[PDB]
Amino acid sequence: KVFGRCELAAAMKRHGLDNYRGYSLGNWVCAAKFESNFNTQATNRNTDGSTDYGILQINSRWWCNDGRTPGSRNLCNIPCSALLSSDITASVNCAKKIVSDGNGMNAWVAWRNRCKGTDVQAWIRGCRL
């Protein structure tokens, strides 16, 4: 599923992402725009053999199990394909764990380089939230 901008924002707000760990909803929508272009089915292989899955591009080295990243952890206790569903519940719950890890939203490279320090509020402007 390829979410709309205000469609996603409403979904993440309902799943408890507005101001989760102090990151306003605009940070999450901006991060999803640039990590996956709002596409739940996005995947990307990295040089280290790991793969990023889903609308927030969660990595297989420590967070989900895809059965092909040797020596990896599964801290969100889910198969990576569960991160690919049109229901973002799995992606949101796992991201809550990632954003609490200590480095915050800097664990997403696209957020750090394309959303951090910007007017992220423009990403929810005009949305009926």
From Swiss-Prot:
Active site (UniProt): 35, 52
Recorded GO MF terms: beta-N-acetylglucosaminidase activity; identical protein binding; lysozyme activity
Primary location: secreted
Disulphide bridges, residue numbers: 6-127, 30-115, 64-80, 76-94
EC numbers: 3.2.1.17
One GO term (biological process): defense response to Gram-negative bacterium
Domain of life: Eukaryota
Catalyzed reactions: Hydrolysis of (1->4)-beta-linkages between N-acetylmuramic acid and N-acetyl-D-glucosamine residues in a peptidoglycan and between N-acetyl-D-glucosamine residues in chitodextrins
Pfam families named in the record: Lys (PF00062)
Positions of substrate binding: 101
Reported tissue expression: In the egg white and polymorphonuclear leukocytes.
Regions annotated as coiled coil: none
Residue stretches making up the C-type lysozyme domain: 1-129
GO cellular component: cytoplasm; endoplasmic reticulum; extracellular space
Keywords assigned by UniProt, alphabetized: Allergen, Antimicrobial, Bacteriolytic enzyme, Disulfide bond, Glycosidase, Hydrolase, Secreted, Signal
Localization of this protein: Secreted
EC main group: hydrolase
SMART domains cross-referenced by the UniProt entry: LYZ1 (SM00263)
Entry function: Lysozymes have primarily a bacteriolytic function; those in tissues and body fluids are associated with the monocyte-macrophage system and enhance the activity of immunoagents. Has bacteriolytic activity against M.luteus.
Extra remark: Lysozyme C is capable of both hydrolysis and transglycosylation; it also shows a slight esterase activity. It acts rapidly on both peptide-substituted and unsubstituted peptidoglycan, and slowly on chitin oligosaccharides.
Family per record: Belongs to the glycosyl hydrolase 22 family.
PANTHER family the record matches: LYSOZYME C
Assembly information from the UniProt record: Monomer.
Protein's recorded name: Lysozyme C
The encoding gene: LYZ
